[PDB]
Design a binder for this molecule. Structure first.
Ligand code: COA
Ligand code: COA
Ligand code: 8LE
Ligand code: 8LE
Lengths: 477, 477
């Protein structure tokens, strides 16, 4: 095949840096005939499915009840048709039965290097247990993809996303470290951090910046209040993940204008680290490329989980080709995208997402880069005695970043107990909701029976102008 | 000497794990006769001074004006008497002239791996540029010291300190990673993080925890409001840095009681990463050991910068023995400590700080693990037109963590312009002070000429009961 350092389990040369003239970090893997890479991906899929069958009782159970065995994997058509999709709810149930990391972890406990996770659910939150070898594989894949964006060794890379449970910032960091770039992990989340960060960007003048697209808009506003020019931060490129925006003109163009630098979209899911497997390149700067030999992406018809033709829309379904810990095999994203397989300006022979990722097959939405499930807001409110049985969700972006508004009904008893009791229920609901979601929601009370009861109810209003036209087009096609 | 992996520049075996029965990660370095290690430290000091002379115009300039050359370094007595101490203000001036990392950086730009830094000063803040090889040296030294605390491979290690500019959390992380412990970088600083963290500690039940001592007290209070038992977090040990507390009975004992686990003190300075060079051990659990072959600590008489005898108090002065990037040679801490050189319960032949570190030779104080210079609060306020020329500083710890209160005079003109103008000056002073300090200060206004003018003024009142007796004893001896 000629594919660079192509084996499972993967074990990249940590000293490899491509020649300075090279556009591609791995010229063969990135430009080889797609049909040839597809033969190699099938070969890999077979090893990964065999590996999961032997080390993941989660997959053995799932595949047995679907009537699938690794011996039945003969083509990519067998892969889409026979292998059932994994849902995030299955992953959550596996961990409830086999904590801390489910019976899909595969690796022994002694191999676990970092513990990360997610927020958003009531009950026990899901944990990520990333093996030592997978951390190196993620670092190596991200450095390759960041090289694709024009980021080079020695470049100062500002990671201005929270360093906590979430894989986003850790992935951009691990990528910067492997690239021999000067990683600058400023982080995020403490009120006051933005005013200090703009001083550090004016002083350090990094070549690259990573965060959420809306945070970069917020930071431009902060730099101006701080009497700083964001055009003088020395930025060559900004790359974002966590939410839609970097492939949306009314978002991307405002960032390119504020900073005078190119913006790159990247990012699938945290369960899919290396999450930059979907990422734009310096020449293919609009939307994202599907880096198929790192993670195998299939854009699927959600009714049958089969690949849609190119030029068509569907839901991304992902498979780890280079992970031994918690490998995801056909994980259903639930997102929507249009994929195409035309000639890319950068020369990479990868499928493309020309407008990035937008929209969902379910009722999930994002608030400041955080996934929000309305069923989870409903479960959190129903755990409260003072809850009056009904609520409404209003999403706005009146300033640079999202605001989540909850209009909650108090019980009649709480309302009768007076203004003090009412205010106590509101603050307790806000505390409970924030602990569950991982983000601050704004909570307001309405009259005890003022909201309509529709016994499934559609409680969410997405009032974000920047996504309105995109939400209407999902209703046209 | 028999000293394990003893060379400069250092290059540790990344695959080395000590035998499971071993108390010491490096038995020879940790238990060898002190006089023999001292001969080796002199040998190292000579290489480090020669290395700085060739690669740091900062040190060449400093030593020339002090009348010192590496050829004059023949004994540890020559080291204390001839080599002038480095002050943090010199480091700040070197960076103003030779940004980004001063002319003490030594390594070429291509070697820089991580950019960190500090807060606390008006103007350009000081940056840390840590080389790739030094990051490995820090990871390796911290894993050795964490092994000394009884932390073992496979142990889940919760790092509940902010992941941003500060070296603290990064150092505990790098240490956990090298130790083959399961690093759990939860982080800190976003309001709401504590309520979620206690859920994660109840669920993940880590063996070890890292943060500030007061944060662990705050977190115990949060676990109780969250209806959780902090005694059921599975903790074996908590290790802290950033502020005094882990060697103070009225602090340490409340933590040991709340969690039912041993507490370890550690931490010198962020400029001195690996900062755990001063750290307690599982058997020498009270106070800290000076791990002399990692960083050379000298407890000095601040009038002449010469070592005080054992049993006496002085200021720690530190020297990097295993750093090529920004190596610190005789950096004056300005802190106070009592050092002793008696037989240690763990068997380590190191000098000991039996009561940790407490007190300063200057007016610096700590607020929630953050260094605060009153001269810097004065400089920040004098940049404001609405400032009335005077203020007072009140430090309290009424709840689990410090509160910094500023009583600020508005100008007569601002006071005459009314309640609106007054409130505008207060909010702007609070914003300016927080941006400078890196921590939220509480700002209250007083009458335009109500504060006494003493043309140097002593504006700070440390009203923290937990440090009162210790502050009085510094006045006795
Ligand atoms: C960052 C985070 C911890 C803040 O918590 P929160 O409830 O949203 O907090 P608030 O809205 O009250 O904002 C607190 C501060 O965090 C900042 N902030 C909010 N969302 C942020 C984000 N996604 N990235 C960076 N900073 C963010 C705010 O601007 C504010 O600081 P400032 O007023 O000094 O500017 C939270 O949004 C989060 O965990 N997001 C994770 C999603 C994510 O970023 N994933 C994608 C990886 S790029
Ligand atoms: C963590 C930090 C960013 C918070 O900023 P701040 O101005 O102090 O913020 P606030 O006092 O308004 O507190 C905001 C939240 O951070 C938490 N917090 C405050 N100081 C903290 C600390 N040192 N460690 C962890 N969390 C901390 C608060 O408890 C609060 O969360 P909660 O109400 O949900 O519990 C700040 O204190 C800091 O940068 N400290 C660095 C010093 C340090 O920790 N160094 C030693 C390494 S161990
Ligand atoms: C991608 C990452 C690691 O930053 C992340 O947020 O992971 P997470 O698993 O928490 O959430 C993934 C979901 O957020 C949304 N999302 C993430 N990145 C993008 C993106 N770049 N564009 C459009 N939506 C995105 C998608 O709906 C996706 O299903
Ligand atoms: C040690 C570290 C990396 O956490 C840190 O805070 O580094 P920094 O350079 O910012 O500040 C060091 C100062 O904080 C105080 N400090 C840090 N750790 C301790 C400690 N363990 N005990 C008593 N004081 C401490 C000392 O006064 C010291 O001078």
């Amino acid at each position: 095949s000629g594919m660079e350092e192509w084996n499972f389990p993967v074990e990249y040369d940590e000293n490899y840096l491509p020649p300075a003239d090279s556009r591609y970090w791995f010229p063969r893997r990135e430009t080889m005939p797609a049909a040839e890479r597809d033969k190699a991906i099938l070969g890999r899929l077979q090893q990964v499915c065999q590996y999961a069958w032997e080390h993941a009782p989660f997959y053995r159970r799932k595949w047995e009840e679907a009537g699938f065995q690794p011996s039945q994997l003969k083509s990519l058509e067998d892969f889409e048709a026979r292998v059932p999709v994994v849902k995030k709810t299955d992953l959550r149930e596996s961990q409830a039965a086999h904590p801390p990391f489910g019976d899909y972890v595969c690796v022994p406990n002694s191999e676990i290097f970092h513990v990360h996770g997610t927020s958003g659910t009531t009950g026990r939150p899901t944990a990520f247990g990333i093996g030592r070898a997978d951390w190196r594989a993620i670092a190596n894949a991200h450095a390759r993809i960041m090289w694709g964006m024009g980021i080079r060794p020695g470049d100062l890379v500002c990671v201005a996303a929270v360093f906590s449970l979430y894989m986003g910032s850790w992935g951009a960091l691990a990528g910067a470290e492997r690239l021999r770039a000067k990683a600058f992990p400023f982080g995020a989340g403490a009120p006051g951090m933005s005013a200090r960060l703009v001083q550090w960007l004016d002083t350090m003048k990094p070549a690259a910046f990573y965060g959420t697209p809306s945070y970069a808009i917020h930071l431009a506003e902060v730099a101006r209040e701080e009497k700083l020019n964001p055009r003088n931060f020395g930025l060559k490129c900004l790359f974002f993940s966590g939410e839609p925006g970097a492939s949306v003109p009314g978002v991307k163009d405002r960032i390119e204008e504020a900073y005078g630098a190119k913006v790159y979209d990247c990012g699938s899911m945290a369960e899919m680290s290396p999450f930059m497997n979907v990422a734009g390149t310096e020449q293919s700067n609009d939307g994202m490329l599907c880096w198929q030999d790192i993670i195998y992406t299939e854009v699927c018809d959600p009714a049958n989980m089969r690949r849609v033709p190119y030029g068509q829309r569907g839901t991304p379904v992902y498979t780890h080709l280079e992970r031994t810990s918690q490998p995801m095999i056909r994980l259903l994203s639930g997102d929507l995208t249009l994929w195409t397989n035309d000639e890319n300006p950068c020369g990479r022979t990868y499928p493309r997402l020309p407008q990035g990722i937008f929209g969902r097959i379910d009722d999930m939405f994002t608030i400041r880069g955080e996934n929000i499930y309305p069923s989870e807001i409903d479960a959190a409110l129903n755990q409260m005695s003072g809850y009056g049985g009904e609520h409404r969700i209003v999403i706005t972006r009146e300033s640079a970043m999202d605001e989540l508004l909850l209009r909650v009904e108090p019980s009649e008893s709480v309302h009768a107990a007076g203004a003090a009791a009412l205010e106590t229920f509101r603050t307790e609901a806000s505390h409970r909701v924030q602990t569950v979601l991982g983000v601050r929601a704004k909570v307001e009370l309405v009259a005890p029976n003022s909201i309509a009861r529709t016994d499934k109810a559609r409680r969410v209003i997405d009032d974000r102008e920047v996504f309105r036209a995109l939400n209407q087009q999902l209703q046209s096609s």
